[PDB]
Design an enzyme around this catalytic site. Sequence first.
Site, PDB file in Angstrom:
ATOM      1  N   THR I   1     -26.427 -12.958  -4.868  1.00  0.00           N
ATOM      2  CA  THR I   1     -26.378 -13.906  -3.761  1.00  0.00           C
ATOM      3  C   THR I   1     -25.089 -14.783  -3.880  1.00  0.00           C
ATOM      4  O   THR I   1     -24.717 -15.201  -4.991  1.00  0.00           O
ATOM      5  CB  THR I   1     -27.690 -14.718  -3.763  1.00  0.00           C
ATOM      6  OG1 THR I   1     -27.490 -15.967  -3.104  1.00  0.00           O
ATOM      7  CG2 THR I   1     -28.230 -14.903  -5.252  1.00  0.00           C
ATOM      8  N   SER I   2     -24.414 -15.049  -2.748  1.00  0.00           N
ATOM      9  CA  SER I   2     -23.234 -15.920  -2.691  1.00  0.00           C
ATOM     10  C   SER I   2     -23.384 -16.990  -1.619  1.00  0.00           C
ATOM     11  O   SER I   2     -23.510 -16.675  -0.431  1.00  0.00           O
ATOM     12  CB  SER I   2     -21.972 -15.118  -2.397  1.00  0.00           C
ATOM     13  OG  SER I   2     -21.800 -14.096  -3.344  1.00  0.00           O
ATOM     14  N   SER I 129     -24.899 -15.519  -7.777  1.00  0.00           N
ATOM     15  CA  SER I 129     -24.373 -14.533  -8.717  1.00  0.00           C
ATOM     16  C   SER I 129     -22.925 -14.174  -8.420  1.00  0.00           C
ATOM     17  O   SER I 129     -22.148 -13.879  -9.343  1.00  0.00           O
ATOM     18  CB  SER I 129     -25.199 -13.277  -8.624  1.00  0.00           C
ATOM     19  OG  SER I 129     -25.084 -12.750  -7.309  1.00  0.00           O
TER      20      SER I 129
END
Lengths: 244, 232, 241, 222, 204, 250, 241, 196, 196
Positions: I1-2, I129
């Site tokens: 995930t960003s 992440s």
Amino acid sequence: GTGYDLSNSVFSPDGRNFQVEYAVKAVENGTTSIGIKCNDGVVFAVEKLITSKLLVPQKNVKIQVVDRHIGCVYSGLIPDGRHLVNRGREEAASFKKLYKTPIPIPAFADRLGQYVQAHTLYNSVRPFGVSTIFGGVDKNGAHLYMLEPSGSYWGYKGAATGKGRQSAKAELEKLVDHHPEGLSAREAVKQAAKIIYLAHEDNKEKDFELEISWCSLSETNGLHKFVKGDLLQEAIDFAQKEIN
Amino acid sequence: RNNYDGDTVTFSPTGRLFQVEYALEAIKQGSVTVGLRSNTHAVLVALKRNADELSSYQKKIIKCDEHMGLSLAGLAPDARVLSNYLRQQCNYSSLVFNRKLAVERAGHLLCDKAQKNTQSYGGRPYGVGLLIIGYDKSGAHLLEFQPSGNVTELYGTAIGARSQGAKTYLERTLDTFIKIDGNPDELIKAGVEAISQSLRDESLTVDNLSIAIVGKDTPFTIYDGEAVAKYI
Amino acid sequence: GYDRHITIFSPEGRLYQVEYAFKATNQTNINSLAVRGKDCTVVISQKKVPDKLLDPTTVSYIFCISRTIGMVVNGPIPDARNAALRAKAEAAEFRYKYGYDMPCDVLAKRMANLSQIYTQRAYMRPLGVILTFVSVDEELGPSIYKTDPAGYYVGYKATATGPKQQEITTNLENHFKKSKIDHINEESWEKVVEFAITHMIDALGTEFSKNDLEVGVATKDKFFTLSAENIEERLVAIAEQ
Amino acid sequence: TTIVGVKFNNGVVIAADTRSTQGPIVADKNCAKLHRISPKIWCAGAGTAADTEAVTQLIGSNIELHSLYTSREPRVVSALQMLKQHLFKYQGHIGAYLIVAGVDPTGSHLFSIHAHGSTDVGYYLSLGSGSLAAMAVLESHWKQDLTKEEAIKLASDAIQAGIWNDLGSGSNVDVCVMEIGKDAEYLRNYLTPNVREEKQKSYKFPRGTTAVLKESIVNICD
Amino acid sequence: SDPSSINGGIVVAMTGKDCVAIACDLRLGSQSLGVSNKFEKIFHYGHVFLGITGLATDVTTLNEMFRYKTNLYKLKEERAIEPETFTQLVSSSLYERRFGPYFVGPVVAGINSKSGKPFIAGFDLIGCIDEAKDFIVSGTASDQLFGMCESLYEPNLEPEDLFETISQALLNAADRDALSGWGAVVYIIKKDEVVKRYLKMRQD
Amino acid sequence: MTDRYSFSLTTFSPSGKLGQIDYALTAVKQGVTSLGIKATNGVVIATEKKSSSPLAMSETLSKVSLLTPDIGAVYSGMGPDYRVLVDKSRKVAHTSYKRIYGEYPPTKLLVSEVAKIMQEATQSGGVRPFGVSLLIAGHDEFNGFSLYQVDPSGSYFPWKATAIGKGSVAAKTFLEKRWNDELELEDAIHIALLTLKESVEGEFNGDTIELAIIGDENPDLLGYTGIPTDKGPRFRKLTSQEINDRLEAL
Amino acid sequence: GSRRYDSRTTIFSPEGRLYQVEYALESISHAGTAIGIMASDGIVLAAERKVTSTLLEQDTSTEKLYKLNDKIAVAVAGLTADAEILINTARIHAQNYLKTYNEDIPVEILVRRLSDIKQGYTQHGGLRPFGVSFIYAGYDDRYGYQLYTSNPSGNYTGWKAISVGANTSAAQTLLQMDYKDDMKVDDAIELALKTLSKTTDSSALTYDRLEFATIRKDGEVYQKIFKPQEIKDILVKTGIT
Amino acid sequence: MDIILGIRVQDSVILASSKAVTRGISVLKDSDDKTRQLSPHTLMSFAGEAGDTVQFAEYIQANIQLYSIREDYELSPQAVSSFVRQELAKSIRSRRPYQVNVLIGGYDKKKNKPELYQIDYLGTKVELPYGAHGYSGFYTFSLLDHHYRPDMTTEEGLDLLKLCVQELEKRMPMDFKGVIVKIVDKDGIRQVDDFQ
Amino acid sequence: TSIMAVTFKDGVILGADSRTTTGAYIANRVTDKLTRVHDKIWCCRSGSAADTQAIADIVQYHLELYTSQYGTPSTETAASVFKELCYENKDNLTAGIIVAGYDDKNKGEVYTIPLGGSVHKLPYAIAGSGSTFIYGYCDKNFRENMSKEETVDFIKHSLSQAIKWDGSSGGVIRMVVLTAAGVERLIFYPDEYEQL
Ligand SMILES: [Cl-]
Ligand SMILES: [Cl-]
Ligand SMILES: [Cl-]
Ligand SMILES: [Mg+2]
Ligand SMILES: [Mg+2]
Ligand SMILES: [Mg+2]
Ligand SMILES: [Mg+2]
């Protein structure tokens, strides 16, 4: 029927809660105490009857702080006042712990109000025997509030309660006339000392000691502090002059 | 008073709390006790009371810490309760903060403990009066505790039966004894005189006199019996 | 003490404490009335500030319960704020638990049920207040629901509350009997506010200044209260017939 | 298990397979994995079989009572909130993996819930061991604005992909269709592609084949 | 130690024309040691029959419990509980202990006094209701019972025939399970009468 | 600040009477008339929706209330008491039955459950009895149609017909004359409207009358199809129109 | 606080009587009469319904005779709603004893506990007593057919024949006249019906105002609660119709 | 693995229970009576984890004795064994479960039939003609399966039991210091004092 | 995930990817990780979907109640409620949240709350992440007081890089623009942002 004034949460047949009205009587027998709202803060002042020259002067303080920005003063049963204030301190801590911002003055009023109203709900408690004047500076102004044993409270331009309330109110209504464009923190301190001195004539029986505190965005940076030392003497003077 | 004095949760139609007032009546039947302070010490004098010629003299003074103690007039049990709570607070302050408990602050805590028992059903007010003395960071202190909850700081005072005698005397002697600095024996002497104005058909003896003192460099100490001969 | 002091039956079958609670609702000597527009809901209530020392802006008996629900109280301010907090809470909890906005009527029922309780459990007194709830419900359209100390609640074409409750009700009845509909067929809420102030005046036989009134409007989007200046605008228009 | 949900232009359809398994043994060849929460809110469950019907009935029970209290038609978001907060309270120990769908006065809705209490929104969803075979179909044929007949078929083909290609599924296809204006129509065994061929023999036994030691009548009437 | 594999045993029930039958072995052991050959695993509450496999202390408890519940049910409803209803009662009773469950695998069987329809059902240890129309298996020999049932069984057998089939199913399954056997019992159930036969089988 | 009323508010008087129950009955007697009638193929319950302001919307308030898909309730007395009893009743039919047996409770048992709640308000600490009588009507498979009355004491009894509230004595006597054990449902609806007609003083129409029936199953009211054995619901409230439509044939 | 409204329900009169127990007994004395008679071969329960209207349905009605258990039944006199509470706790206790010992509960142990519960409401908790009296008719494998009585005080005692509710001094006097230790069940049945017909506060004794049950001796014990028709029959057979 | 044996002959029930108590490496006692009398015609023997064993026993004892005095009546053996099973079945799902097994032998003075009951720490209960707990069944069940007759005299039972004990002395690694034998019959509980 | 949030001259923008994985299977490919807690207070979710959703849901509750009583809450107040929940519950939560909001006095403000419950106020924050891969880029390209178009471009390029190197991030890029003008939603699809 008769009987409606021996328990607390009881409605009389004309819709009243006599035990609350009886609590007001304890308030009215108390010392006179006031609040004046100004352009960027509030002033609090109270009459300390010198029962006896045996009391240490300056040393039975009556105005209490809540958090760092709120001032409280009350008339009536003093130990009830401390109690309400203690609750106020907890209520102000809870609010800050969750919301970080120190509790806004109206939000604090309702915290006190809701609690005091709570003590008119059950015959297993008696109402608060104090009317309380409090206020401070928050993210958008100064606010002065007064709170009765009923739990009623409203925001004021100026407020009084105690034995000398009528002189005080009359003298405060005057204050809203001369000086209506606004009243500055400093003039409000002076005027406070005048009104306490004038209101004291309904207690002329005993000698008394003046105690003032203020909370000014400009003169205290928004924090609640006691008017002591030189500024205090100047206001005591301004009282002597304007009473003669 | 008739219909409005059966508990601490009922106001009189004029604003009074009879249960609290009747509690004060218990103090008035208690034996006289006096406190006064200078800028360096604070003194307690109490007249201890016996029951028969065969009984002891009910103790009147209780140490709370090395810097704080009190005298009692009224229901001695309630003084036990209150003085014991005072010992706990003095001790909490010491342990958690390495800080001696301020006399002013003990006063605040006492007021609040008592006020609980004027808004609580099923409770009763405390039937005792307390004179509290101590030396803290702001000097000598004398407090008077009333069962209403009202705690007051004074230069001197007296509670108990016929206490007006000493109270009146201290009001005269005020400017004199405030100044008794660095001379504890002379402040006690002052107190023993003040309490004398409240005797009636009795004179101070080794068996009934009781004295406490505290102050700068003088931990709270209690004198009874032969120790108090010095002062008669 | 009697069957007069606590919430128990009298031989007549009556709860005197609920009756005396009702009496206290008028203890403020303030009237309020609410009407429905085509797609809005308006409540009007008198504002009486007699003390020059009071801050008029803090004197109100109209509360914003949620984004969509307004509540106006007839009765003493302490009980009224007590009721107001509890409803603000009940409405926030409803949203968390169930995922849509709490409807006006449901909140009324929920507060009415709480009222019933103080009617049956002896240790709690009733609250001396009557609650007037307004919203534009996403299902029901404009809505008016009212609660009293007996635990009663119901919905109204329109309603009014206070010491001259009767004249206002009979006034509004006649106007709907003439128009043959249950609402102000007006698409602006400003006009509906004017209707309200008008038929209010006509039944109390007294004129109003911009400080005698207090106004709340409920639309699809939100519930807002008017300023003394937005009110002065309404009154001006009423003054031009 | 293989369960899917598919939104179409004026509704939502959900489908499921019918195989229930203990390890590698089929325990029910015709389990019913579609559950009613309210008349117009149906719900397909995968994971611990007792946990899905337990949790769908609890919320359903509560949703019913909520419906009567508020005199309103139940809303999918209300099933969704009540389920997820329950699953979350149980920190994942209630192995319910659900696809919840329905129509209510605010429209048609398609959500999924995981055992730990997270939720998704979408136009096509699948859960279960056949999750991936069905989704291969869904990702290869879904378009915006399907018709009730396209959406039923797409949903039914996705369950099929699971039945054939997943060992954890599944004998038949259950479908349930929730169109906006209409009642929910619940198509049990909408599709039955796994009829057992006729056995090679009858194993009916000669009477008397079994050796009996004792015999007696049992009393039922008290 | 797997609590399901301590005492052992099996139960099976299946449906025929206007009849149901339910049967069970009689073994109770502790691991390898055979301990009793009189441990019946089929109970009845009125006209509803309940067999239980699994940890034997739980079988006993669940029987004692459903007696208690069905007894109170008859007192309050003034009818006897029906099989459909009781299945729900067992299901919810099991799940009430979802996180500390009884290590049991119940089978319900009966004919509905009002509808006449034959009914059978089984559960997992936490209440999931498998309501098959054909047959239900339970115990340490369920896999064997599934293979015996899936062939030996055809729908609508007459009671005399249903008996032969269920008996051969039970017996031959138990004979390939080290934890079942030591005797068997078969209930054949019609709307009016119930017959109970003890079968003869290897004693090893 | 807590319920310090741990003791009963209903006690025996030296005459043997339980005062507070009697008074609750008094309140029931003041209530608006309500009635129920049992037929061979249905039951009917009706009461008067006498609004307390013409500005009130009568439909926003149901005095006839669905308990289960097969049970309805009407009352006489203090509405606010009735209302919290309908809530409590719906919940109990789930918690103490549906979640246990997967069936709704049969009429007698739910009546029994409500009865228990009212009994308790007669004996528990710090509470008054309920100020209502309930008429509950419904249908279960093994008992058929039934009608029960529940009083503030917690007592219940089953009726062929009865009425409670204001004009009960008149309507009770009226019903004893016109009731037979061969009435069809539509017949009882008629007798129901007529008995109510006597007890009502103002307008008497389908907007001032509430009336519901326990009858045939309405699969059109189910909400879903495809489960052939889910029948129901047998409860049904009559529309404003359906009431007027039958009022001409009066 | 609230101590003002506490009617002390568990206090002694200066004579050593229990106010609420005595008053509760007064309550019970206005209740339909119920009689219990133990024969050498059975037991009979008969009681009178005070609630009777044409429209009352009696096929589905129970008011006085309740089944506790397959081998125990009670005749109730007093608040029927109080009775049902006490019955279910008893109905349960019986099932608890069965679960624990795999034996049916002996009649006295159930009666003892139910009286033990009543006795409690007499000594602590500040609640009112149960306005109920019970006639217990049961059979157990140790004392055989048994007949017991319990009242609001929690005291119980055993009887050859006994009556509770209205007019018991009258009825008890009649039972003393015609009762013989050697009676059979059908004698007691007639002694029972013939006592009620002489003590009824009603005009004549009809089947629609009776409940009736007999527990008698296959080698086990059957428990029979007569239906309206069975009662009508027994009323003619003995010549009271 | 103490020895808890039981056999139900025609007129009585016989309980044999190892006499040894070993704490680790030493044999602390050789005269231990692993039995409690639950009432005049019901006897319970027990073996299992230390302390749990007697605590449970004496608890069941005081409970049956309380029932006897309260009802002036002696519970049947079936009912005692049912009270005991329920108690163990509660413990098994409790915090610290009792680690105890029991045999219960009593003469049912009402049916005039002896009865033997075997119940494990899990609450598994079975009525048996003969029974054992722990490893004792492994050596003795083959003897008992063979020689046991339902109409045996008390004297025949004792003999059959002696055989079981000798097989236990031959093939079992632990010296269990012999058994104590007790008989429960129409006349109560007596302890066979001469078992050689 | 960003996920990231950036303040600019006119306010603040939140952006995120749309991919949530169970293992290496993409369970949802269009998830909406930008979550509304108040009119102009949003957050970016990273960690447990269950946990972060539960937190946001609760914060939204607390802010609705707050609003009822005390009017609009500050962005700082919203960050305190998140931080309170997360720190007091650190032993049972895997939640990393970015709180982003607007008012007229402070314009945009950004608070990051990583695992553990600390709070950090910053000009921008990144997290998830995929954040690790763009620490260098963002540090070399962020500027205070950018324009809206500059800011969307900064966020757009950053996440595209995160999405490129992190298998756990991907899908579309979502942004929410919080200014005095109101609330704007932006979406960008792969065929666009990959070519960047
Ligand atoms: Cl508020
Ligand atoms: Cl004990
Ligand atoms: Cl062990
Ligand atoms: Mg609700
Ligand atoms: Mg149980
Ligand atoms: Mg027991
Ligand atoms: Mg949490």
